[PDB]
Amino acid sequence: NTKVVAIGDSFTFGYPGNTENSWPAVLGQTSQIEVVNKGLKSQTAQDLYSRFDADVLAEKPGRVIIFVGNGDAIKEVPLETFQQHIKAMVEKAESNHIIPILALPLPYTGVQNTIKEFREWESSYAKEKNILVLDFATVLMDADNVYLEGLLSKEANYPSKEGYKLMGEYASRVL
Numbered sequence: 208n209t210k211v212v213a214i215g216d217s218f219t220f221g222y223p224g225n226t227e228n229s230w231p232a233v234l235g236q237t238s239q240i241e242v243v244n245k246g247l248k249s250q251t252a253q254d255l256y257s258r259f260d261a262d263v264l265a266e267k268p269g270r271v272i273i274f275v276g277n278g279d280a281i282k283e284v285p286l287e288t289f290q291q292h293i294k295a296m297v298e299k300a301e302s303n304h305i306i307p308i309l310a311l312p313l314p315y316t317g318v319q320n321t322i323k324e325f326r327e328w329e330s331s332y333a334k335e336k337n338i339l340v341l342d343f344a345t346v347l348m349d350a351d352n353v354y355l356e357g358l359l360s361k362e363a364n365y366p367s368k369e370g371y372k373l374m375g376e377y378a379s380r381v382l
Contacts, residue, residue, distance in 0.1 A: 210242075215250070218313060237376055245263070277312045
């Protein structure tokens with residue numbers, strides 16, 4: 208019902224922090240709802256699709272946030288494969304009467320061109336289908352795709368606990 212499942216990659220697990228400080232936990236604390244974190248490190252959309260039934264369907268949430276693509280770019284999964292898999296998760300969610308919400312993958316220094324491509328396509332696919340989109344970049348970074356003050360973790364490309372806090376706070380306002 209107001210229950211949510213966040214399925215994603217390292218950026219949903221909350222790397223490099225622990226999953227307990229990740230954005231889905233904050234989402235839940237802020238919106239005073241139940242959010243289940245099904246983010247696993249470095250996963251591709253195909254990886255998520257495969258565990259979609261037990262990780263999402265079986266939870267009987269009313270909403271599912273699908274935040275993926277970073278892992279796909281790291282592992283050179285082509286645009287055609289990423290598309291097909293985003294589509295499949297949306298379709299199964301909808302077949303199950305679960306409202307899907309897409310989270311764009313984030314700018315990431317190793318693969319900016321590939322990420323720009325994934326994000327751009329994902330935005331237009333979400334727009335033609337009236338699916339709600341989460342753009343975590345709007346609270347994490349500046350016009351140059353660089354993390355704002357105190358938001359970058361000790362590893363490049365990944366958010367600090369505060370970064371994850373603002374991501375969770377942004378999602379609570381959007382949802």
